[PDB]
Amino acid sequence: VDVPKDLTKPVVTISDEPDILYKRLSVLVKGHDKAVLDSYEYFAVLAAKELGISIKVHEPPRKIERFTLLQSVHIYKKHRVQYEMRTLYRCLELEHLTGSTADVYLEYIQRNLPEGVAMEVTKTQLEQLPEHIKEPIW
Amino acid sequence: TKEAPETDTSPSLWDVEFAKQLATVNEQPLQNGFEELIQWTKEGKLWEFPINNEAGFDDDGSEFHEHIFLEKHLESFPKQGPIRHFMELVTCGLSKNPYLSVKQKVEHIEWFRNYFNEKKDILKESNIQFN
Amino acid sequence: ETYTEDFIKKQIEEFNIGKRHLANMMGEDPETFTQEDIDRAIAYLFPSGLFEKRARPVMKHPEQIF
Amino acid sequence: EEVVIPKKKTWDKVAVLQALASTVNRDTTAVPYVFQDDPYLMPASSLESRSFLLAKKSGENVAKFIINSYPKYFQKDIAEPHIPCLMPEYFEPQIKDISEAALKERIELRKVKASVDMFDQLLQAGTTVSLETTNSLLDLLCYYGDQEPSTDYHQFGVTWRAKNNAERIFSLMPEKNEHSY
Amino acid sequence: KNRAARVRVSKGDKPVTYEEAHAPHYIAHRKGWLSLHTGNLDGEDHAAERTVEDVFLRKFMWGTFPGCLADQLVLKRRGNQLEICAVVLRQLSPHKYYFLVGYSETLLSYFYKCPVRLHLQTVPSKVVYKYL
Amino acid sequence: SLSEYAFRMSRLSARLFGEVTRPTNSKSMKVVKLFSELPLAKKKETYDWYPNHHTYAELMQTLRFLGLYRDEHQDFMDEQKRLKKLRGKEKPKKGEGKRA
Amino acid sequence: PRRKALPPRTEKMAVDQDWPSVYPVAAPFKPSAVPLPVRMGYPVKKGVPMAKEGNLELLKIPNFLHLTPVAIKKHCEALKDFCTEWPAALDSDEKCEKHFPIEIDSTDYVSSGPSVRNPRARVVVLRVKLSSLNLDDHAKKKLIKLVGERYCKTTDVLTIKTDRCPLRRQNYDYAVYLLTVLYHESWNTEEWEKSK
Amino acid sequence: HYVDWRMWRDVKRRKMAYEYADERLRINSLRKNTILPKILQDVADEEIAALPRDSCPVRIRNRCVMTSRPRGVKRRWRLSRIVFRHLADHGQLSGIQRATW
Amino acid sequence: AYQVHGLLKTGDNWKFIGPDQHRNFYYSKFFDLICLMEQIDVTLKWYEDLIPSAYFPHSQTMIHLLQALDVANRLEVIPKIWKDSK
Ligand SMILES: [Mg+2]
């Protein structure tokens, strides 16, 4: 019964300079758990559909980095302990975004990136020819 | 209001003390997690999203051509000869170094200028005129 | 291990109450929330990669657990 | 055919956060967020509600007291970008030379005792003190009534005293502008 | 015989926690990592600096909440943030706990130049998984 | 071998892309490499390899003298030191020792 | 006496509350605040997984309780306001590369720690087809001889990758500068080129 | 307060080597080419051979940061195998497990 | 009172409610008035919203909620009111 009133919305100023265009925007994420990357895929793919972005997902193959250590403090060279670090992947292929759409969506999904997960965001920006390339100077 | 304010005059103790307690009016304990992230972003404690890996680094507002084009700094050196050849390798390497500022690069170049200026006699014996 | 019949009934009670909270969080109909919806929801909300399934978070009917 | 390239919306660095906070209203089952959310640390009365927040704030003063008393243990900046507010604070004037600039430090640092002592020596030297500089010194002395603001560690009745230094300084002041009065 | 991070069997009378009851060959199988950051992922940097910070904090917390911790810390990192999730006991005054939360958080934020939070979870007694 | 055109073209591309233009032997191209990166000693992993052990011990020592940190190890060593003193096994004063 | 802990507030929670209010942002699993009888832990023989209370296994999960489907949809509604619309003229990739022949690639690296810096961020890659440029036969030949392996004949794309400069700003500027002076030099016909 | 005097001697070596790195770089560059006259490169040889011996970067040793061990250190964590394993075996290194395949 | 409270909840006005003293005073008075002059069902709605979410009661404001329950002849709730009192 105590619902607040006159909900103040943030100021989104529409400017007069044009917007960036991204042909695509690949988002690779890297974690140690696959279930965590499954929950982050569900979150990010839903967030894109609730924002009208086209998104495809695939799993790049994993990397298992192993190395060996000695098991004893002094001798016993034949006895080792072996360790690994698995890096699991999921690539979010977004397509046909404007700079502001990207800006909002990345910020959102990056602030909710879980602990132990990294992200590499490749942005393919569309651009037209520089003015100086329009005509030769000869 | 007064057409022309005293912009040259700066606020006084009374002014700022009043500003402090004008803020105390609206200060309330943080209400939820969003408010702490908002408070931390305003204080500069939290990163701003979406992240730029160069957030806070402007590189002394240098332009690309000050890192890449370093021949203007070779004007005090011999225009030909082994010193030119050598310094043309220093600047080629310096012009490829993404870890140095333009100021640091110019320090390297200026060292060799002072260094070859001290070895004039060595350089003159080998018939390489420095200046 | 001593699970009195009263102890189990207090567990079935908590599961039914919890079953409804889980459907509420997931935005689904509390009246058609099957176990397979409980498992899918619990897997998403508490993601664990532990290679053993018996070590992962679970929310099952007390009769299938005890 | 022609690209209808739209316009770049812009916003503040807290805007998206604020957009997301709009979606949530307070939780009735919870105590205020400033408290710890444990059944055993949740305040269970208005007295505790007050007492628990003072304890948390008391521990922060002890931290800030240590941080500022042993700066060297906190002078290693790892943050990128640099966070100015998680650095130690330095309250002592670092310039001991008698100069106009060194006066500003004692005024900016609200060091009433340092300023008056330096002012006395500076006046004996005979050097000229700017009107603006003298005015700023007066504000500090008057605002706090020649009573040093207490910080960290080292009511009923009339606190004003007729034989106070502020009155004396005005007499020594050769020029008194409107701000002085 | 292997020794690393094994609690030996004893006489059926030793309370051990789920954490203590599991040997290193169970670290991705039946139990998780007590810390979570990105340093040890393929292509990532600063695993060393994260590791020194984690060794200090565990030590810092153990002596700062003497006799209170009921298990091991869970250290989390998200971007710029650091989360310390302790399970403590219910013997200290909540006044003292609030003093220590406010103290530790503040001191650690100025030391490691980041926002540091500390989430306590009190238990009556240390949760016993098994009597070895 | 390269034709004059092939040669004059690769020199034009090198001028454009900012590579060495003078003919330079492999021994002298080290000068470029030397200035193209940081010196090993200047890299962070090198000069900042160790934790500042002076800061971690001095901080945690005052935090103990301030009462805000319990050092179980230093408590252990103080106890042992106290007992040895009772047994008479106390450190001799520097210089004013048994010998001259 | 000894301070007693209050009961968990999950009991005072309504089976139909809005869950997003309880966990608005990412926060660690609290047993006292989550009305789920969730158990975790490899069970002892003839035992059950361990209860939520004091369960360090559940505290090691990075949970998604702040991002339920409900919460997400609500969130994204408040964020539709911030995003602008894709040019409906640029339907296909064919149309994208008709109107915008140049493509600029760049990567951002999100990682946890005190410092946000990542030296891989500075790299800029400029991709373009040579069919989108105003090049005759003469010039198209010399441009291809000047860039070397930066050009792929199969795809006809010239790729300029720059990372000499500290900033991505400066590298992008350098990449454009290069495409520019490569284009104007491919049009200039030096006299020595008659020795081909 | 470093683990021992061998670590302390490396702490100083790393610090001095950092102080002189720019000078050492500049002098090497002179003597690392065939361009310059040999009478000049010979002076450079003398000059860099006269810089303090503890500025020579090859004298830095990568010791365990926790226990000062001069061998058996993994470079990603700067820890000896004994110290690395102790943290890895308790679950305290993010994402590192025992390998089986 | 609903207009006064209605104003506080508009926009960012709630930030003017002042220190804890002011805040208890406000909510203490505000709720006493609710229990006295409002339907019991709506008093219980405001009871659940304000406590302990926003306000830790005083001993008295439990009495008023008891009285208001009596006036409404709703004694099936008095048990619950005792638990909360503890
Ligand atoms: Mg063996």
UniProtKB/Swiss-Prot annotation, chain E:
Keyword Ribosomal protein among record annotations: yes
Protein's GO biological process: mitochondrial translation
Subcellular location as annotated: Mitochondrion
Domain of life: Eukaryota
Entry GO terms, CC: mitochondrial inner membrane; mitochondrial small ribosomal subunit; mitochondrion
Keywords: Mitochondrion, Ribonucleoprotein, Ribosomal protein, Transit peptide
A Gene Ontology molecular function term of the record: structural constituent of ribosome
Family that this chain belongs to: Belongs to the universal ribosomal protein uS3 family.
Oligomeric and partner information: Component of the mitochondrial small ribosomal subunit (mt-SSU). Mature mammalian 55S mitochondrial ribosomes consist of a small (28S) and a large (39S) subunit. The 28S small subunit contains a 12S ribosomal RNA (12S mt-rRNA) and 30 different proteins. The 39S large subunit contains a 16S rRNA (16S mt-rRNA), a copy of mitochondrial valine transfer RNA (mt-tRNA(Val)), which plays an integral structural role, and 52 different proteins.
The protein, known as: Small ribosomal subunit protein uS3m
Species of provenance: Homo sapiens (Human)
Phylogenetic lineage: Eukaryota, Metazoa, Chordata, Craniata, Vertebrata
UniProtKB/Swiss-Prot annotation, chain F:
Annotated spans, Disordered: 80-100
GO cellular component: mitochondrial inner membrane; mitochondrial small ribosomal subunit; mitochondrion
Residue ranges with Basic and acidic residues bias: 93-100
Gene Ontology biological process terms in this record: mitochondrial translation; translation
Stated family: Belongs to the mitochondrion-specific ribosomal protein mS33 family.
A single MF term (Gene Ontology): structural constituent of ribosome
Pfam families noted in UniProt: MRP-S33
The protein's name: Small ribosomal subunit protein mS33
Biased composition (Basic residues): 82-92
Keyword Ribonucleoprotein appears in the UniProt entry: yes
Cellular compartment(s): Mitochondrion
Record key words, sorted: Acetylation, Mitochondrion, Ribonucleoprotein, Ribosomal protein
Subunit architecture: Component of the mitochondrial small ribosomal subunit (mt-SSU). Mature mammalian 55S mitochondrial ribosomes consist of a small (28S) and a large (39S) subunit. The 28S small subunit contains a 12S ribosomal RNA (12S mt-rRNA) and 30 different proteins. The 39S large subunit contains a 16S rRNA (16S mt-rRNA), a copy of mitochondrial valine transfer RNA (mt-tRNA(Val)), which plays an integral structural role, and 52 different proteins.
InterPro entries associated with the record: Ribosomal_mS33
Curated annotation (Swiss-Prot), chain G:
GO molecular function, a single term: structural constituent of ribosome
GO cellular component: cytosol; mitochondrial inner membrane; mitochondrial small ribosomal subunit; mitochondrion
Highest taxon, organism lineage: Eukaryota
Primary location class: mitochondrion
Keywords in alphabetical order: Coiled coil, Mitochondrion, Ribonucleoprotein, Ribosomal protein, Transit peptide
Localization annotation: Mitochondrion
Keyword Transit peptide listed: yes
GO biological process: mitochondrial translation
Protein family: Belongs to the mitochondrion-specific ribosomal protein mS35 family.
Subunit structure: Component of the mitochondrial small ribosomal subunit (mt-SSU). Mature mammalian 55S mitochondrial ribosomes consist of a small (28S) and a large (39S) subunit. The 28S small subunit contains a 12S ribosomal RNA (12S mt-rRNA) and 30 different proteins. The 39S large subunit contains a 16S rRNA (16S mt-rRNA), a copy of mitochondrial valine transfer RNA (mt-tRNA(Val)), which plays an integral structural role, and 52 different proteins.
Protein name: Small ribosomal subunit protein mS35
Lineage, highest ranks first: Eukaryota, Metazoa, Chordata, Craniata, Vertebrata
Entire-sequence positions represented here: 48 to 243 of 323
From Swiss-Prot, chain H:
Compartment(s) where it occurs, according to its Swiss-Prot or TrEMBL record: Mitochondrion
Keyword Ribosomal protein among record annotations: yes
Entry coiled-coil feature ranges: none
Protein keywords: Disease variant, Mitochondrion, Primary mitochondrial disease, Ribonucleoprotein, Ribosomal protein
GO terms (BP aspect): mitochondrial translation; translation
Keyword Ribosomal protein on entry: yes
Any one Gene Ontology molecular-function term assigned to this protein's record: structural constituent of ribosome
Family to which this protein belongs: Belongs to the universal ribosomal protein uS14 family.
Record note on quaternary structure: Component of the mitochondrial small ribosomal subunit (mt-SSU). Mature mammalian 55S mitochondrial ribosomes consist of a small (28S) and a large (39S) subunit. The 28S small subunit contains a 12S ribosomal RNA (12S mt-rRNA) and 30 different proteins. The 39S large subunit contains a 16S rRNA (16S mt-rRNA), a copy of mitochondrial valine transfer RNA (mt-tRNA(Val)), which plays an integral structural role, and 52 different proteins. Interacts with LIAT1.
Disease: Combined oxidative phosphorylation deficiency 38: An autosomal recessive disorder due to mitochondrial dysfunction and characterized by perinatal hypertrophic cardiomyopathy, growth retardation, muscle hypotonia, elevated lactate, dysmorphy and intellectual disability.
Protein name in the entry: Small ribosomal subunit protein uS14m
Natural source organism: Homo sapiens
Origin organism lineage: Eukaryota, Metazoa, Chordata, Craniata, Vertebrata
Residues of the full protein shown: 28 to 128 of 128
